[PDB]
Nucleic acid binder design. Structure first.
Lengths: 67, 63
DNA sequence: CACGTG
DNA sequence: CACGTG
């Protein structure tokens, strides 16, 4: 229940309530949560390393829950 | 654009054929590498500097 | 314009 | 690992 974990949870929750295969950008996420895109991306890539999220390469990249 | 100037001088004040890096310029100038580069790429497009190498890039006055 | 970078 | 980016 740390502040960083709360942030990770906020992002994971946002993406989970997105839908089946729907993805979103770091830009959108940053805007909805009121957090700078840099911090968001730092968390998104980190969570992808942990396997919880999948990055769909592109410009910009799209993010969603893994598998 | 005083910032641009300061960087511009420092660079012309460099040895004949010696090229430097944004990282080095940051330490040698006590300025964030973000602004350094912002200037470096601008001066390069403006033809006042030249960039070579790749990872990272090396900067020296243009001839 | 992708950029997350410690 | 480059990264300059508003």
């Amino acid at each position: 229940l740390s502040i960083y974990q709360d942030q990770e949870q906020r992002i994971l929750k946002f993406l989970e309530e997105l839908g089946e295969g729907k993805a979103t950008t770091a830009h959108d996420l940053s805007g909805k949560l009121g957090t700078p895109k840099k911090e968001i991306n730092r968390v998104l890539y980190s969570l992808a390393k942990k396997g919880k999220l999948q990055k769909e390469a592109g410009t910009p990249p799209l993010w969603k829950i893994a598998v």
